[PDB]
Structure formats: C-alpha cells, structure tokens
Write a protein that binds this ligand. Structure first.
Ligand code: ZN
Ligand code: ZN
Ligand code: ZN
Ligand code: ZN
Lengths: 56, 55, 62, 51, 55, 113, 1073, 46, 51
C-alpha cells in the first residue's frame, strides 16, 4: 500500500509526474498482469484458522 | 428537475471488474454497442469502411 | 422437487440412488450414503440434502 | 403431451443428463458435419418415452 | 419599472390562458384532461355566474 | 460528487450483459460488484468526443486536485499479492520467470540475468 | 429441566399458536365480539338495532344465485373473499359485505385438514392471515403511544414552563375524543413558581386551585389533601403555597365555575363532565374521582421537579400495536356512522328499503385495496401503508411480512432495552425508514382486549376501599391501584392482594393476557386489559421447593408433552409477561446453570424459554448469528426476503404476476432449531454450494464471485420464472362491448408492431406456443382499434396456462401465464446468510477450476478479502460445521447460543480425514502444479437472490419522447433514457467540458422556438413555408429570430406567462458591461 | 381428436364460442384452461 | 407424458452433459520434498496436516 497505493510518495504519483498520464496508466495493467497471474498460481485464502489464538 | 438536470444515447447495467482491461477501457456488452450509435459524416477516408458497416 | 441426476460438483450420476437411500432408512434402519457409494461430500451433500417436494406436488388433483 | 408436475424444459434438462451408451461413439458423426438437413441414423439416436 | 412592470399590473384584469403543450390531455384510446385544464374551467365558470348576476 | 465520478473510457465491446471496468479505477467512482450499476453516455460530435478524451480521459485523472495526490492505486488481489512476491523468500524459476515476462506487453524481449 | 428440554415447550407453543397467531387472534376479536358493540351504541334513530349476523363467503352475481365462495377462486377471478352482514333491525336486514381474513374462522380453511386442503388446491403450508381483495393478497400492517396515561416532561431552558405532565385521554369504546390534559408548571427553576393546567375548549389556562373549587373542593388544605399524601413533606407543600395564593381570590363553587370565560357559568360545567379527563367517565356525580386524579397528576409533576422521579421515558415500549382486527374497527365505525345518518334522510322525506348496504361493502374495499384508511372523498388526510401486497418471493419472506410493524414519524429508531424478547433486534430495513419498521420475535404475541369489571369487582371485594371516600392521613402509605389508567381506590396491606391475583391468573380465572404490575418503590398497582400490548412467555421460578431452593415445570411435564400449551398455562408453569410487568420481575437466562473454548459466562421469578427466541423469522435462519458483526446479521435479515425457493406448493395452480422457483431446492447442511417452525427444511431458500474462499483469476475480486460453469450446467441454481399478463372485456350500461379476436385491417389501423399469428381465433395463445420479442399475447378490440396485449419487450419464454372466466359483471375475464427457465449468468447476484452478498464476475469449468486431490472442486470461489472487515465469522464456521455434516450425514446445528464450539467441530473433522481447520491442498487447474498455499474449501449455503442482470441491462438512443416536456421518457420498461441530473451536470462543469455538457440539448430537449425581436416572446405565428412570420399585437413580420433552447425551458416560459410574469428573450445585449 | 377448453377440477374437454356461457357440463365453477397446442414444441438438453 | 429424444455426439466443452469423467483424483510428492507448498499451521505442520 505504501509504495503502490493512492498515496503521496506513491510510485504511481511519481510515474505520473515523471512519465506522463499515458505511461503511468499503462503501468497499472502491467504491475497488475504480472502479479495477478503470479497470485493465480501461488494461491491465497483465509479461514477460521486465521482467527484462532495460541493455546495459552 | 427538468433544466439543471435531465434524463439524456445512454445506457446502464451491472458492473463487475475485469483484471485484463487496460486501466482506461470499459467493456461494453455487444447488445449495448448494437443499440447506441454514432453519427459519422461520410468522408473519402471512411467511405469504404462505412459502406461496409452499412451493408 | 425430484432427485438431481448427477452431482453438480463432480458429475457422478445419482438419480437411481434416491429410492435405494430413502429405503435403507425406512427398513434396514441405518452410513446409508457410504454404502450407496457416495464418497466425497460433493455428491454426499447432493442426496443428504434433497427435499423431495414432487411428493407434495403430486398430492394435487388434475 | 405432459401432465407431470415438472415443466417441459425441466424434464428436458433431466434427459440431457441421462447417460447414454457411447462405445462406438467414434464411428458416428457430429450433426454439424453430416450432410443431412437436421439429423439422421448416420449421426443421431432417436428415443421414445410414454408414461 | 414603467415599461416592463407597472405596480398596477400586479392585479389581473384579463387572464392569460396557456395552450395544450402546457396542459396536455391524455385520452384512453374516453375523457382524460389535465389538472390545469380544470382550474381554468373552474375559474371560467366562477366568471360566468358572476357576470350573470351583474346584468 | 467528484470530478472523477465521470470519466471517459476506451470502448471495448465484449460478450455477456455487463460493463467490465478495471479495478484500479474502482475507488474514484467508489464502486464494488455486489450489484452496483453504472451509467454510460456516448459523445456525438467530433469535438464532443475530443473534449471527452483530452480532459476526461481516465489517465489524465490519476492525480486528484482535491488532495494533490493520486486517487487510484492497486487494490485487493494485486496489492495483497504484490507484497508476497516481493519478500526475500520469494523465488521463481525459469519456466515461470518466462511466462511472467511474456505477460508484460512492453517487454523488451530480454530475460534479465 | 435441562436446556434441550425447553425446546419441546416451544414446539408445544407453535403446535398451538402458529407463526401468525397475532393476525388471526386479533381478527376473530373484531368479528366475534367488537363488531357487535360497534353496531350497538349510538344506533337507535328518531328504529333500533340488535344482534348482527355474519355469514360465510358468498358471490352474488347476476346470472347465478349466490355461489358459496372459496379462497383459491376469488384469487384467480379477482373477487373479494367477504361474506354477508345482517342485523335484527326494529320498527333480517342486509348491510354490506365484510372481507374475511384467510385462515381465520369464517374462512373455510380454518377447519379442512392436510388432505382436505390439497383438494381446494390451497397449499397446506400457507399459514394464511391475509385478505384477498380484487385478486391480490393484501396484508394489514401493525401500527404502533398508548393512551390514558400520565407522563411528565422537562421543557428546555428557553421556555416560560419548567416541567409539565400530560395524559392523553379517549373513550376505549364510544366516539373516542382526542383531547389531552396539560398540567403545566410555570416559573423556571428560579423566578419567584405557579401551577396552571389546560382544558379542552378553554382559550387560556387555569391555575389548579380554581380547577378544584370549580370541581367541588372549596377550602385550602382540603385541596392540598388530594395533591400531597404526607403532611410531613413541607417541600412539596411549600411549592403549592404560591399556587394557593393565585386562587385566593375565588372563594367558592359559584365563582369557581365562573372564571372560565349565567350563560357562561352553565358552559363551565359542560367542559368538566364531558371534556375534562373524559375517561374515568363523563357521567355526573363523580366529580370527586377526577379530582383525585388531577391531584395524582399535580403530584406526579412535582415528584419530578424535586428530583425524586425522572422525566418519563418516551420510548419505554411497554407504554406503546393496533393490529388488523382493531383497524377494521375504527374503520367500520367511520362507515356505519355514514350509513346511520344516511338512513336518517329517507326518514326525513317520507310524508307518510332505503339502506344502501354498499357504503359498508365498497367503503371497506377501497381502504384494504390501496392502503388509505380514512374514507376516500376530499380526505387524503389519511395514512397509506396500512394493508399491502403480501410478499411471495420466498416462504420466509411471507412469514416476515405478516409479523411486521409500522410507526408514523434519532431516538425512536434505536433498539431500546424494552425491545428485548418482543421485537427482533436485527431484522429491520436499511436506509430511509430504519427502526420505524419492526418485526416480531418468535414468542411475542399481542394482547387482544379483555374486560375490566370482572376484575374491578374481583377487587373492591378483596381489600379495595373505593376512591370515592378517601382520607390521605388515616391511610398514609396506602398503595393506590389503577385499572386501565383509571384510579379505582387504594388498598391497605397489598402484598397479598398481589399474590392472589397472580394465583388467579395461573389457574386461569383472569385472562393470561392481562397485566398486573406492583411498584412497591412508589406504592401503586397497575392493571392492564388493553388491546395492543406485546408480551412474551416465560417459565415461572417460585422458590417452591420444600426439597431444596426452582422451575415449577419438571421433566415429568416435559415427557408428558391432550397436553397442549393451554395446559402449560392452566397450571401456572408459564406466564405471559408484557413489557410493563416485565419491569418488576427477574428473568434467568439458561434454566440449568442459573472448558477453554466456549464463551465466558458471568430472587428469580421467571426463566427464559430460550434466548434464541428473542429473534424473529429473519435471523432465525442465520447460522451462528452470535458470531457475526451485528450490523451484518441485520443485512442478511433483509436479503433473505429476496432469495429463491418455493413460496407455496400450490404454485402450479396460481395465476400471480412474477414468481420464482429454484429448480432444485436444498435444506441447509447447518440449521437453526427454530427453522423447524419456519418450515424451512421443507421450503429452502437456497442450495449447499461447494465454496472455496481463495484468490484465483482475480475475477472474484471486490465482492464478485467465480461460479463453476460445469455444475451450472448440471442445473445448479437454475430457476423457473413465471408471469401473468391479464385483461378484461369492458362494457357500458349502454350495450357497447369489447372483443377478444384475431383482428387485422378493417378501417381503423390501431394495431401493434409484433405478430398476431400465434393467436388462435379465440384471441388467445395455446399453452404450447413459444412466444418472444413482442408477439401479441392477447387480442382485444374496441368498436377496429386494438387493445391486444404484447409480451414485455425485454422478455420471452413459453405460454404456460391460459384461462377464460366470468366477472361479477358477466364480462370475459382472461389471464395468461408465461414460463421461462432462468440460468445463472456472469452477472447475477447471490449471497450467503451473512450479508456476504456478491455477483458473478466470470464462470470457469472443471478443468480451469482449482482442485483438491480427492477430485472435489468448488462450485463457488469467493474472495478471502470479503472476510477481514465484514467480520462475519459464523460464515467461516457454517462452512466447517457443514463440511462435517456433509461427511457425517448428521444434521449440523448452527442454532444461536448453544454448546458447540470451533474447537469441537475441528476435532470431528479430523476424525473424518481432512485438516482440522478446513484448509486443503489444491492444484492450479491450468498447470496441475500444487498451490503454494492451502484453501478454506468447504460446503456453504448460498441463496440465489433475485436481481439477475438481464432484467436490468438497458440502453437507449432516441426513443419514445415525452409529451409535455418533449424530453425522453422515464424508466427502462417504457424504453426510457437515463437522466443526466444536476450532479452529473456539475462534474462536467468541473471538467470544463463546455461543449459536451451543451450536447442538455442534443441528447434530450432541444427545440426551435420563434421569438419576437420586440416583445421578447414565443408569440410569433411562424407558418414555415410561405415564410409568413408575423406576431400581431406587436404587429411584426420583419424583425424575427429563431432560437435553440431545451423544450423544458420553452415550457418554463409558457408557464411563467400564464402566471402573468413575462420572460422576455432578447438576442442582443443592450445593458453592456 | 380435438379439444378446446378444460375445467379447473373435473378435467373434461369442453369447447365453446361467444355467448354459449362460460361454465361447464356440470360443475358451475366457471374457470377453464385452454388445453395445449397441436404444433409440437422443441427443446434443448442444456 | 409423451416425448421423443434425439442424441448427438458433442463434448464437455460444449456441455457438461457430455464429459464421461466426473471427478478425478490427482496428487504428487505427498511428502513435500519439492516444496511446491507452504503448510499452514499453529505449532506443528506435520502433526496438524493429514498424511
Ligand atoms: Zn459429487
Ligand atoms: Zn445426419
Ligand atoms: Zn412582438
Ligand atoms: Zn366442470
């Protein structure tokens, strides 16, 4: 979130300013396409198990 | 009610995001595209394509 | 509302198995599923959750 | 004709799922390739049902 | 303003009757008359009787 | 309630009965997919269009004047995962490092050492 | 008696009362009794009335006798399920048709059994409770501040008044005046503090002293006699002092009744015997009584202005529901009374039959039909809402609808404490009206209306020394007693008066419905017979154990359950506690009781049947509602009324517009013990989907879910959709009838666009026909102009059942029903029972799908992201539990506060073979390589909410234009166009998108008007051809301009003109700048 | 061969036309459905 | 109830009513040696995760 969010220092905020509307707008799709794809294979989930505290 | 804002070549349906669409795109259901038109004057650059689209 | 041919989830047939099941209960007083050959829960839930409305519908006249 | 409490296409569905034989399924043709308008013995199997 | 609006005209002598596109009628293929196309007639009638009491 | 509650998009005719929008352009309209609906308007003059693409294009909107910072980032899956993929512990082998480079359209066509 | 026992008791409850007790119970009360008392009061005319007859359903149609009518017919034929009314009039007589309440008493259904019903085509499962006016099923909605009670309010720093006490009064039976009593208290908490009160019809206010002397008490201290009951309370008395001085100027009953302005003095009396605290009685020789009240009042005032009693709690539910039965009452009167003074005119013309029994038939219909109680006429000053269109989306939808409450309009919307037990905390609409609409718990019931005297008597003969003769000092701490808001004397030692009435109710000699509250802490006795008091049932504790320390009920009573719920009450084992009486009891939660897993748990008079009974229909279907963020439960509380299933079984013989049936239902893998009374297991709202909470294609993102196409094909979540277009053949007293044929040409043209060919010559289609696009479904004509019906443009399907029929007016009635199977599509909405709503983003198949070694693959893939902030965890639990119940065949209980834990279920799941937490290994459907992670894969119930895309998708480009405006038309159904309202304007303006915005014109209005170059108006007579332009009156033909403005605006102007204002339009600036 | 209208209960093939009343060959109950079509309906197995 | 069915070739792509498969088990390297997975756990993966 800190490095790629709708934040100030935002790598996005910077790529927009440094490269332009266009270049940065494309930047999303890419960072996306790579990651989303990767996640598709690495998987990820959540279940009651994520909400239980240590025995003690 | 009628002047500062009126109902207006428009369409509306349900959204669902698509992770394979350039940031600025917006997938439109064929159905809709086949309903909304666009007045393009005939010009010797697009006559050929238009006469096709028309047929 | 009748029995569902083949399980949604995996696909294995399950139309025939209705009467076998609803029977192994009334009489043999029984697990039923397991012997009927319904292993993994996908098909399991299929039978064990069917509420046969057709019966009541059938109670109507013409 | 159909006086069952189930609707037409509900039963229609049902039969779509009923498992048919498919041993020599390979020596039959896809209705799409068969030169017969609609269907025939050379690419289909017709069935009856009366109740 | 002596030209566009003189104090007196705040009182009406002759009433401006607006036309159809204003108070359209909606027939059922049967009557069907707009709201205003009534309080115009209610007024009209309240005018008739008045005069027929002054003559 | 935003300058961004309305933005010009590139049209992509697709099948199935629904407007398919990108995730990162989610928070501007502030939509989700639990049934939410969207209105679409179609320019009609040659300039009308231009006026729509030269000032209302989604790309021009990335940096919001109200809070002098962008207003569209990487949400959910893409964010969550981009994190994992970054850790020193995250490693990928050739077979995949390739299918990954392929997905980047601008890829120079050169696998990094 | 353990916990698992209390269930049989509850079973015992519904076996006898049934989900809709309230509605019916309250109806019979109007028919049986009430209805009589109403016709017999201010009847007799200068001709009297006696007993009235109420027959069963009938149909008086010309061309037939009087057919004994039945529900399922009136339904199809759009009639009225009402019967006749006769009255033994004195010098037998017919007076109106009363709409009966289905499943009531005069409704034949009340008796017929299982098999009996199946023959009337009426679905057994239909619990009824609704009316059937002109076809559609109408449900009367409960309308929630009780009357005849004392209230004290503090009035803001800015006000000449300090505190004030009020009491709204109205005759429980007889006219019913709505005039309230104001016992003010001027002088803020400082200035040198009088007490004045307001009376009906009196211009100004009167200082209490006078009100007393004018009453019948002339000396001081005899006045203080009534107000204060303790000569040693100088404070209060002090307060009164200044007041006495106020009236010191009027020293007797003569002057007393005077200052109230021979002619005037007489009127004074009136406003005291018929207006002043009119309840109690408006007789005559009771002056005394009212005086003790006005004394008990002036007391209550001060009791607060001296910080001894708080300001009255405005929202203490106990002091607030006019059900169906009552409504007809106040309604009937309004009617019968116009009949009364109608019958007065026939008698005032006969210088020597007449009773138009249509005002009571048609009057009743109007209301019940629309929802406007108060008459019709130039009286819209009524309330719309009362009586609606009974829901039929799902079974749990209908139940809910009947158990609903209203409340005419930041504090009321709150969930008060008093709400415990009587109303469901979760089920209540979002936005708009939220909290103004409450639903009843399962156990709640409403009072009905008992009689006072059999208890007034039963009292003044067991210690109640009547008020009439009272002496404040001889009887100091005399516990005063009230009856339905009236003061019927005090009582000496009450401790017993109390535990005698309470023993009287338990044997059943003073209706279990009456309320008796003893407030020792104030010395008073509350008596309530009232109609509209919500009450719940509880086990009685009584330390009645000469063998220990205990619930009167025992495990012998239980297993004994000719032993209904009527006996559980006729033995003093259970009591009906209204909200008021509740105040003075102590309720124990778990009967029994009162591990490092379960939730940590922290004089008794009663115990709770079961805590999971504080819930109403809605939540009752929610698994582990005690594990989710409350605001979520509140949502599911709404979506349930929007899922699919089976709303009745007779559905196949129902001609209702819209109705959906889920192809294959499925009782849930996890359930509430309560569901058992919600017939839910036999009428499910969904199916058990093989869920899989994980990330994948990234199409299950932002509440959009992935659904396994493959199983969507095997029929998962498919549903039938019905519809019924209907028409009639109108006539005129002047023999001119319409027609049902297959019209073409024939001098008129008035026809449609579509085809009529699928129309047999009877002007109808056959039930086999596959109709679509717009195809004319029906053919009608008007002598040849067309009145034929077209299948809605967005729709299509197949005809499913056509039917011809008579009308009361012997007209040709014909309804048509069309069927369609609706398949789940990449957009349709779904949701579980946890506010976990989401729509389809895409659909993959088995291969593409991720999977587990076993083979098992998900039907649904929702995103792990919809869990962290939603907090709905029970969702996570239902899955686990249900993954066991799946494997074990045993029903998995999810029911509220029980003894089942996450640690427990997890152990049960380890006995079967899979991870103790659910998670399973999965191999990515595209590559087969394992997933670096594990997934929460497990069967969860999912309701297929209505709202499928293809019923919303709409697009327009220049369609039907409006008439007045000339702008597009509204709504997607009439081909309308989306509005570009203000806010959309704004934005474009922010963008500096000048032209596009201007393009309000091109995409909507626009219009060419012709202005005058002189009087800037739209006068110009522009005959567009011969160019002739003109504008006489301004006599021009030379200087004229044409302009382009939004017709809405052209109209703005024509409008302004007809209002005499002149919007001149000028084409050139002259004022400069 | 041939059928026009049926009755909601005593499903007995009737058949009428204008003015011939709208009842049944017995049961007064004036309902009546308009029996299926002759032209066969064709379905898909999905 | 009178019908008349017509059967045809086709595959699971076209419709599920075709594929003759219906559930298929698949596993490999039961002992995570290839480390194509990262076991979830509270204390001990091995004991908490079925062999
Ligand atoms: Zn299966
Ligand atoms: Zn062939
Ligand atoms: Zn002029
Ligand atoms: Zn008949």
């Amino acid at each position: 979130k800190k490095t790629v969010g709708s934040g100030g220092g935002g790598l996005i905020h910077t790529v927009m300013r440094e490269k332009g509307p266009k270049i940065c707008a494309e930047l999303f799709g890419n960072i996306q396409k790579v990651v989303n794809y990767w996640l598709l294979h690495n998987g990820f989930s959540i279940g009651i198990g994520d909400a239980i505290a240590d025995a003690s | 009610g009628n002047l500062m804002g009126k109902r207006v070549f428009s369409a509306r349906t349900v959204i669902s995001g698509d992770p394979n669409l350039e940031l600025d795109q917006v997938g439109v259901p064929i159905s809709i595209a086949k309903t909304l038109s666009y007045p393009e004057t005939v010009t010797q650059y697009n006559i050929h394509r238009l006469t096709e689209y028309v047929r | 509302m009748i029995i569902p041919v083949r399980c949604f989830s995996c696909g294995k047939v399950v139309g025939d198995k209705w009467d076998a099941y609803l029977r192994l209960l009334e009489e043999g007083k029984q697990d039923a599923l397991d012997e009927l050959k319904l292993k993994r829960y996908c098909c399991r839930r299929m039978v064990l959750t069917h509420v046969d409305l057709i019966e009541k519908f059938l109670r109507y006249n013409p | 004709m159909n006086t069952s409490v189930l609707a037409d296409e509900f039963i229609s569905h049902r039969l779509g799922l009923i498992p048919l034989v498919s041993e020599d399924v390979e020596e039959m043709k896809y209705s799409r390739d068969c030169t017969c308008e609609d269907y025939c013995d050379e690419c289909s199997v017709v069935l009856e049902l009366s109740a | 303003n002596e030209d566009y609006a003189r104090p007196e005209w705040m009182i009406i002598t002759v009433l401006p009757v607006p036309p159809p596109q204003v108070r359209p009628s909606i027939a059922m293929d049967t009557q069907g008359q707009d709201d205003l196309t009534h309080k115009l007639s209610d007024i009209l009638k309240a005018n008739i009787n008045v005069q027929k009491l002054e003559m | 309630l935003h300058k961004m509650s309305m933005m010009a998009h590139r049209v992509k005719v697709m099948p199935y009965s629904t407007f398919r929008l990108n995730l990162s352009v989610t928070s501007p309209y502030n939509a989700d997919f639990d049934g939410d609906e969207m209105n679409l308007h179609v320019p009609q003059s040659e300039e009308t269009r231009a006026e729509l693409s030269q000032l209302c294009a989604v790309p021009l909107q990335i940096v919001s004047p109200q809070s002098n910072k962008p207003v569209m980032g990487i949400v959910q899956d893409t964010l969550c995962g981009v994190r994992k993929m970054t850790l020193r512990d995250t490693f990928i082998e050739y077979e995949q490092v390739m299918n990954m480079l392929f997905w980047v359209p601008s890829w120079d066509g050169v696998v990094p050492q | 008696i353990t916990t698992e026992d209390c269930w049989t008791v509850i079973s015992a409850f519904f076996e006898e009362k049934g989900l809709v007790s309230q509605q019916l119970d309250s109806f019979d009360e109007f028919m049986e009794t009430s209805i009589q008392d109403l016709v017999w009061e201010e009847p007799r005319l200068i001709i009297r009335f006696g007993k009235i007859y109420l027959s069963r359903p009938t149909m008086t149609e010309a061309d037939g006798t009087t057919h004994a009518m039945f529900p399922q017919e009136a339904r199809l034929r759009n009639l009225t399920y009402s019967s006749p009314v006769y009255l033994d009039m004195e010098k037998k007589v017919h007076i109106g048709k009363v709409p009966i309440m289905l499943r009531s008493k005069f409704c034949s259904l009340r008796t017929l059994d299982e098999v009996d019903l199946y023959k009337m085509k009426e679905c057994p499962y239909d619990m009824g409770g609704y009316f059937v006016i002109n076809g559609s099923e109408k449900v009367l909605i409960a309308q929630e501040s009780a009357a005849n009670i004392v209230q004290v309010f503090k009035k803001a720093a800015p006000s000449p008044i300090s505190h004030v006490a009020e009491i709204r009064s109205a005759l429980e039976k007889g006219s019913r005046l709505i005039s309230t009593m104001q016992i003010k208290l001027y002088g803020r908490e400082d200035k040198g503090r009088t007490i004045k009160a307001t009376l009906p019809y009196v211009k100004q206010d009167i200082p209490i002293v006078i009100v007393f002397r004018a009453l019948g008490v002339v000396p001081d201290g005899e006045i203080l006699q009534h107000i204060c009951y303790d000569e040693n309370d100088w404070q209060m008395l002090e307060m009164l002092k200044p007041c006495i001085e106020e009236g010191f100027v009027i020293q007797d009953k003569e002057v007393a009744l005077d200052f109230i302005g021979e002619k005037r003095i007489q009127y004074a009396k009136d406003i005291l015997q018929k207006e002043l605290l009119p309840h109690i009685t408006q007789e005559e020789g009771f002056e005394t009584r009212k005086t003790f009240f006005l004394g008990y009042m002036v007391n209550r005032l001060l009791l607060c202005a001296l910080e001894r009693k708080d300001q009255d709690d405005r929202d203490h539910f106990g002091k607030k529901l006019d059900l169906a039965g009552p409504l007809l009452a106040n309604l009937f009167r309004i009617l019968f009374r116009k009949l009364t003074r109608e019958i007065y005119r026939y008698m005032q013309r006969c210088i020597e039959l007449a009773v138009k029994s249509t005002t009571i038939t048609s009057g009743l219909k109007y209301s019940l039909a629309t929802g406007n109680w108060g008459e019709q006429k130039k009286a819209m000053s009524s309330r719309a809402g009362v009586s609606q269109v009974l829901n039929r989306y799902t079974y749990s939808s209908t139940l809910s609808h009947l158990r609903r409450t209203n409340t005419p309009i930041a504090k009321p919307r709150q969930l008060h404490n008093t709400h415990w037990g009587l109303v469901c905390p979760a089920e209540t609409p979002e936005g708009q009206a939220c909290g103004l609409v409450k639903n009843l718990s399962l156990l709640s019931g409403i009072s009905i209306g008992s009689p006072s005297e059999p208890i007034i008597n039963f009292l003044e003969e067991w210690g109640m020394e009547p008020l009439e003769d009272y002496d404040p000092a001889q009887h100091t701490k005399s516990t005063r007693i009230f009856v339905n808001g009236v003061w019927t004397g005090i009582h000496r030692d009450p401790s017993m008066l109390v535990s005698t009435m309470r023993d009287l109710r338990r044997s059943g000699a003073i209706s279990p419905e009456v309320s008796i509250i003893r407030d020792i802490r104030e010395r008073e006795f509350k008596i309530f017979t009232d109609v509209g008091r919500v009450y719940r049932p509880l086990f009685i504790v009584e330390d009645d154990e000469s063998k220990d320390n205990e619930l009167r009920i025992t495990k012998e009573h239980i297993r004994k359950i000719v032993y209904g719920w009527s006996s559980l009450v006729t033995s003093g084992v259970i009591e009906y506690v209204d909200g008021e009486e509740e105040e003075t009891i102590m309720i124990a939660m778990t009967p029994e009781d009162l591990d490092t897993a379960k939730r940590i748990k922290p004089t008794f008079t009663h115990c709770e049947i079961h805590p999971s009974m504080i819930l109403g229909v809605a939540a009752s279907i929610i698994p582990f509602p005690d594990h989710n963020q409350s605001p979520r439960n509140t949502y599911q509380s709404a979506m349930g009324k929007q899922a699919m299933g089976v709303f009745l079984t007779n559905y196949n013989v129902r001609m209702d517009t819209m109705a959906n049936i889920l192809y294959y239902p499925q009782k849930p893998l996890a359930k509430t013990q309560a569901m058992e009374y919600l017939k839910f297991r036999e009428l499910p709202a969904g199916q058990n989907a093989i869920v899989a909470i994980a990330c994948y294609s990234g199409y299950n993102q932002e509440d959009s879910m992935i659904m396994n196409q493959s199983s969507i094909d095997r029929g998962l979540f498919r549903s039938l959709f019905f519809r019924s277009y209907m028409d009639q053949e109108k006539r005129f007293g002047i023999s001119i009838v319409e027609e049902f044929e297959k019209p073409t040409r024939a001098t008129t043209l008035r026809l449609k666009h579509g085809t009529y060919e699928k129309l047999d010559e009877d002007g109808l289609i056959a039930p086999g026909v596959r109709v679509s696009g717009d195809d004319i479904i029906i053919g009608k004509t008007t002598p040849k102009r067309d009145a034929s019906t077209p299948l809605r443009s967005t729709e299509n399907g197949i005809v499913d059942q056509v039917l011809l029929t008579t009308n009361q007016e012997g007209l040709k009635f014909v309804k048509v029903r069309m069927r369609t199977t609706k398949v789940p599509q990449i957009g349709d909405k779904f949701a579980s029972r946890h506010g976990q709503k989401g729509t389809i983003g895409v659909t993959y198949r088995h291969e593409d799908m991720p999977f587990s070694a076993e083979g098992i693959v998900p039907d649904l893939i929702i995103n792990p992201h919809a869990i962290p902030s939603r907090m709905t965890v029970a969702h996570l639990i239902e899955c686990l539990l249900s993954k066991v119940g799946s494997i074990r065949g045993y029903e998995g209980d999810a029911t509220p506060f029980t003894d089942l834990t996450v640690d427990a279920v997890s152990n049960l799941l380890r006995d079967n073979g899979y991870q103790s937490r659910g998670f399973e290994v999965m191999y990515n459907g595209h590559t087969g390589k394992k997933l670096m992670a594990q997934v929460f894969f497990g069967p969860t119930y999912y309701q297929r909410l209505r709202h499928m895309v293809d019923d919303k998708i709409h697009a327009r480009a220049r369609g039907p234009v409006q008439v007045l405006t000339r702008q597009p038309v509204e709504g997607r159904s009439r081909d309308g166009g989306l509005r570009f309202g203000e806010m959309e304007r704004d934005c474009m303006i922010a963008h500096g998108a000048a032209g596009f915005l201007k393009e309000l014109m091109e995409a909507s209005d626009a219009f060419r008007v012709h202005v005058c170059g002189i009087c800037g108006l739209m006068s110009v007579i522009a005959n567009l051809k011969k160019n002739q332009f003109e504008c006489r009156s301004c006599k021009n033909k030379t200087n004229i301009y044409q302009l382009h403005i939004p017709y809405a605006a052209k109209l703005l102007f024509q409008e302004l003109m007809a209002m005499n204002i002149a919007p001149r339009l000028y084409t050139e600036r002259s004022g400069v700048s | 061969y041939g059928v026009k209208y049926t009755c909601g209960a005593c499903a007995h093939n009737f058949s009428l036309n204008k003015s011939d009343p709208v009842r049944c060959k017995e049961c007064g109950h004036r309902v009546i459905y308009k029996a299926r079509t002759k032209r066969m309906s064709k379905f898909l197995t999905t | 109830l009178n019908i008349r069915c017509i059967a045809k070739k086709g595959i699971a792509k076209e419709h599920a009513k075709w594929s003759p498969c219906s559930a298929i088990a698949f596993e490999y390297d039961p002992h995570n040696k290839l480390k194509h997975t990262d076991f979830w756990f509270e204390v001990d993966a091995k004991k908490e995760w079925p062999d």
